[PDB]
Amino acid sequence: APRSVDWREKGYVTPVKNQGQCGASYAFSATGALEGQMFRKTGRLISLSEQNLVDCSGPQGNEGCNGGLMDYAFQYVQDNGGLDSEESYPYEATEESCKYNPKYSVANDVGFVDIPKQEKALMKAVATVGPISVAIDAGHESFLFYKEGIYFSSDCSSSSLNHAMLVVGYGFISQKYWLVKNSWGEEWGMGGYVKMAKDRRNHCGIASAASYPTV
Amino acid sequence: APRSVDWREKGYVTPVKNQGQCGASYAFSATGALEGQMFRKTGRLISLSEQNLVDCSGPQGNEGCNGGLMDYAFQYVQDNGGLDSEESYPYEATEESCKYNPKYSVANDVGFVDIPKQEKALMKAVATVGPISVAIDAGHESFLFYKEGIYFSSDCSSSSLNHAMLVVGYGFISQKYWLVKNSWGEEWGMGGYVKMAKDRRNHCGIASAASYPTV
Amino acid sequence: APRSVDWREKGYVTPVKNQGQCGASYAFSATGALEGQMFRKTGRLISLSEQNLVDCSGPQGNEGCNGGLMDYAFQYVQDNGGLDSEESYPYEATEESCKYNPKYSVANDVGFVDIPKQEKALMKAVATVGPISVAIDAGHESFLFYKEGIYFSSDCSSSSLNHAMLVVGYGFISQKYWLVKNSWGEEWGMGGYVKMAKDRRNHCGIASAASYPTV
Amino acid sequence: APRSVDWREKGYVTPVKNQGQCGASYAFSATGALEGQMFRKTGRLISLSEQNLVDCSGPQGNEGCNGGLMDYAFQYVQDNGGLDSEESYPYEATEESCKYNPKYSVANDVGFVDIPKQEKALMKAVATVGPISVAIDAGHESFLFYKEGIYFSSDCSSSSLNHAMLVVGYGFISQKYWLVKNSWGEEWGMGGYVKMAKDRRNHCGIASAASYPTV
């Protein structure tokens, strides 16, 4: 297996987005994972609509700007038979009424897979599938002010997860890390990304809510 | 497949326990699931120690009386090679130092299975495996005062789960429900149990965090 | 959700006390709430020491007979690891040096919850938790001479609070009221209690500073 | 985390205002906090109307020029669906009839968060959110005549608060302080600001009534 993986280098990952003041990280994690799997299938990277998920995936269990689950987003896309492009259904950072239009659908899914709750299994998934949706404890100031290097907080919870993200790879330093895409804009962290401690007892719960869509 | 299932009738379920003021429902859900699977293997129902999990499963990610995940409890039992009986390691409803004694272990596990996030899948699991660990949104006054009949709240979340429980069966009235064991003592609800609305859009998130141990 | 609640009927509430000419209602409100939550936990109602709080909770922010906050009292008990019984540390209605003795501690707390500033939220807490610490505008002659019925003053402030009390329930007339324990002796009001107007625009600020301890 | 924070440097803070002889510091504190969070969302700093709050937030519990709570002000903006600009609804320093015009609304809020009563929690909120509404004991001559340096008064109360303000940052001297915006004009204190002793047992109650709006 590769010692280093970075799906950004292969065209699987859209630029970093910004959820603003709307608590819809689940939507950004879901579009990120779908973007990767759609690229794997078609060879075209097309940015997908988080607003479509915020406005429309309530029946599947999501709650607009008050949270949700990536798997519920994947289920919505399955149930709905599609998901609009970011371009066609841009992000407003507030819960609005569903305005899905099937003419502008550019993605689908048939199901989704939940990865077992081990960093060994997450690593396999990242190496062999593409970018993987995850949730972590992002509540600590140390995370909020993360700038560079490998993030480790002694106070990070693995049980109380509170923020969805997208693992786009992993590597090691000249000591291992996950390469993780956030949704707080390109200015936060390392161009919008964070290297999180890997194989240090499931630090911040990185491996505990991991999944991906099948397309 | 059976239209009605109640694992209490087969000897799989210990009497209702009471977690008191300690937020360790994850531990009660986990012992309940292990109690069922140990019975399935050995033909002996033995009550298991929640305190053992509260005190000892921090390395696996649990947080004493401040929450945890059933799967982390199952992982602890696997890593540890056992779990003490309730009788040997009684419940104190506060986080204490680990006092595990291997002499008094009466349970083990080899791993655990996470069930896909569908009520169809949960029903199959309940019918074919035994009692199943779940988490729900229990944070509504209506749930706290539930007495009888099939519980349904219009305000129940499927995304924000906050209370671990144990599904011990399902059925229908003369209209379907899950039969769910709580850990708030035998006085609450129907002898400590609640019938929760089944096949009504994954009500309260009943199917969203379901799993069981393999023994 | 019950239409009438009275925690006195369930053993949660000690007899009415009398703060005398010492301005320590915060201490009586705090011991009242802790008495309730300790009973919920242990099934034993034991009167707690206001003098302990008046003499010892200065570091947490209280000011003896010149005022304080219930939350500061809860914080003191948490920091201190205990609170003496009323019997061991009797009330003297004047500030003196701290004489806490851990041998005579009969209570503890792990933290405290501040309730949102709405009568809806307060009602839920009274129904589901136990007696709740509150502060009101009690600075009107009509309140001093309250004898019976539902108290309502057209000049009552919802913002400027000046007297701490304990909500021990709520009800309605054959019209709604909060049942509130004062600390002015059993001769004042209805055996030391007042029925205060409920769901009349947060009358006298009863929902504006409500909290309870976790034990 | 940053050792020094000053939100004035980032555009979150309007110039110092002057409440004059109207007891509406709650309104100035609330507009300050909303000004910051609206900037955080939109990138535009627009001065908001205190007079709008003085005249119109009575139903939520405020008392015009005789006091109120910032949370009641936030609740009004939520209930009302907006708040007028300072330019459109200028400050008169007396209680008048509500003249809200929705055409001139420039702000909204979805809710508000009450911060735990600890300086640790306040610091985190200032670092990670923006300017925070607070109330302090300002009723001492030493405060009225504060000119420069770190304010510490031996007789300050942490319990009896009597003046709302806005924490816009914190720092340390070559010894820690909160940077606090007042509403007594730019000639008072340090250009209308005071450095208040930080991490000295919640001096003057600065962490006791802290909150901010979500927009």
Curated annotation (Swiss-Prot), chains A, B, C, D:
Glycan attachment points: 108
**UniProt-annotated binding residues for Zn(2+) 5:** 137, 140
Q: Where does Zn(2+) 3 bind?
A: 71, 114
> Can you tell me which residues form the catalytic site?
25, 182
The record's disulfide annotation reads 22-65, 56-98, 156-204
Residues that coordinate or bind Zn(2+) 4? 92, 96
Binding annotation for Zn(2+) 2: 50, 86
The entry's Zn(2+) 1-binding residues are 9
* Protein name per the record: Cathepsin L
Q: Which organism is it from?
A: Homo sapiens
Question: Which part of the complete sequence is present?
Answer: 114 to 333 of 333
